[PDB]
């Protein structure tokens, strides 16, 4: 009734179960359902309409971000809880209108407080995302700077994989991180320099 009804979507069964127990122990909270894929979240949320959905990003079948996009206007308050502090993930979560974006490297004893704040109409982001992403500095790592150096010289995916002694899919994965990091840094710059 007055309790905050929660659904948890998490593919790692150990964390899913431990989060469910932790949250259920709260007097004002009830874990009404648990799932391991984004489809489990879409199905539950559409059928049962819980107040809150604690959502992992990387899950099989359908991600937490695709699930957040499908549930954009349901009235369910989506709190992303992920290992990944990637700009593309955070940007995609903001566009889906998530109420919260939390990192798995934050105290467990604070999660219930984030749920209460989101129920109070607040938008809760891990300060670390802000501390790392909201910057005009170079976001690229030393490894990413080595990949891009070769790309800028005019070398193809096969040539970069040979020069760095790594797999062809790894070069493509590194390029995806670079494009994402620079696309967010470029959008941040563009918006803040146009507001002047």
Roughly what angle, to the nearest 10 degrees, separates helices 13-24 and 111-119?
Answer: 60
Sheet holding 124-125: strands in order across?
Answer: 29-35, 4-9, 52-55, 77-82, 100-103, 124-125
Q: Which of 62, 104, 116, 155 binds ligand BEF (CB under 6 A)?
A: 104
CA-CA distance, 88 to 111, in Å (whole number)? 23
- Taking the least distance from each CB to Na ion, the nearer of 112 and 164 is 112
Candidate ranges 68-76, 79-87, 155-163, 177-185; the one touching ligand BEF (CB under 6 A): 79-87
- Taking the least distance from each CB to ligand BEF, the nearer of 104 and 155 is 104
Q: Which of 54, 82, 90, 100 binds ligand BEF (CB under 6 A)?
A: 82
Q: Are 80 and 68 in contact (CB under 8 A)?
A: yes
- Taking the least distance from each CB to its own copies, the nearer of 155 and 188 is 188
Q: Are 37 and 60 in contact (CB under 8 A)?
A: yes
Characterise 136 by phi-psi region: left (phi > 0), alpha (psi -120 to 50), beta (else). Answer: alpha
CA-CA distance, 129 to 132, in Å (whole number)? 5
What is the closest distance, in whole angstroms, from the C-beta atom of residue 86 to its own copies in the complex?
16
- Taking the least distance from each CB to Mg ion, the nearer of 11 and 66 is 11
Q: Which of 15, 85, 148, 188 binds its own copies (CB under 8 A)?
A: 15
56 is an interface residue for ligand BEF by CB under 6 A: yes
CA-CA distance, 21 to 112, in Å (whole number)? 12
Q: Of 34, 35, 27, which is closest to residue 4 (Cα–Cα)? A: 27
Q: Which of 27, 73, 142, 196 binds its own copies (CB under 8 A)?
A: 142
16 is an interface residue for its own copies by CB under 8 A: yes
Q: Choosing among ligand BEF, Mg ion, Na ion, none, which partner's interface includes residue 138 (Cβ < 5 to 8 Å by kind)?
A: none
Which chain residues interact with Na ion by CB under 5 A?
A: 24, 29
Which chain residues interact with ligand BEF by CB under 6 A?
A: 56-58, 82-84, 104
């Amino acid at each position: 009734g007055s309790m905050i009804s929660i659904f948890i979507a998490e593919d790692q069964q150990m964390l899913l179960g431990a989060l469910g127990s932790l949250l259920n122990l709260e007097d004002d909270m009830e874990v009404v359902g648990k799932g391991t894929t984004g489809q489990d979240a879409v199905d539950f949320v559409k059928k049962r309409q819980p107040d809150v959905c604690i959502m992992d990003i990387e899950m099989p079948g359908k991600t937490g971000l695709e699930a957040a996009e499908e549930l954009k206007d349901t009235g369910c308050k989506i709190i992303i809880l992920t290992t990944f502090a990637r700009p593309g993930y955070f940007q995609r979560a903001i566009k889906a209108g998530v109420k919260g974006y939390l990192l798995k490297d934050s105290p467990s004893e604070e999660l219930a407080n984030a749920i209460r704040s989101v129920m109070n109409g607040k938008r809760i982001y891990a300060p670390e995302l802000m501390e790392d992403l909201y910057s005009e500095a170079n976001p690229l790592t030393d490894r990413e700077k080595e990949v891009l150096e070769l790309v800028a010289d005019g070398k193809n995916t096969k040539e970069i994989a040979q020069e760095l002694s790594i797999k062809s899919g790894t070069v493509r994965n590194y390029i995806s991180m670079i494009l994402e990091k620079l696309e967010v840094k470029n959008r941040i710059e563009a918006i803040t320099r146009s507001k002047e």
